[PDB]
Amino acid sequence: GELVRTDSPNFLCSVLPTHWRCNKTLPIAFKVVALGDVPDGTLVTVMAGNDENYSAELRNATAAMKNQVARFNDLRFVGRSGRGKSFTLTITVFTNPPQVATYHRAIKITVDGPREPR
DNA sequence: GAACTCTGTGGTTGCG
DNA sequence: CCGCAACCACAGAGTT
Secondary structure (H helix, E strand, O other), rough: OEEEEEOOOOOOEOOOOOOEEOOOOOOOEEEEEEEOOOOOOOEEEEEEEEOOOOOEEEEEEEEEEEEEEOOOOEEOOOOOOOOOOOEEEEEEEEEOEEEEEEEEEEEEEOOOOOOOOO
């Protein structure tokens, strides 16, 4: 599906909603794509940091690279990012040595998530 | 049946 | 004083 470029010329990840509700399933399945070669089985995790929150509590943030793609099963953000602020996520691919791909200011996570005006 | 899970609406409220 | 954008609670309807 939709893909965005990361900090690294070797990895591309799915595009994430601009604003999403904590502990709620994502509208798409987050995936990480490897252009170079990554042997199957290789682990990939994702961390979501912020100026305020340092590494938001996540759910299901670890996947294994199957045929150049690490399909995350129902990844979820439990920690909030702070009024008006977003999460930058770090993609770490555990090959030797570990490679890293950062997806700057990707998604804001609030208790309500996007809501109809009042 | 109890105990979750999910998603929307209502009550509040600092900070512009 | 107004409102947005957040937080907190919890109701209703499904699930496990």
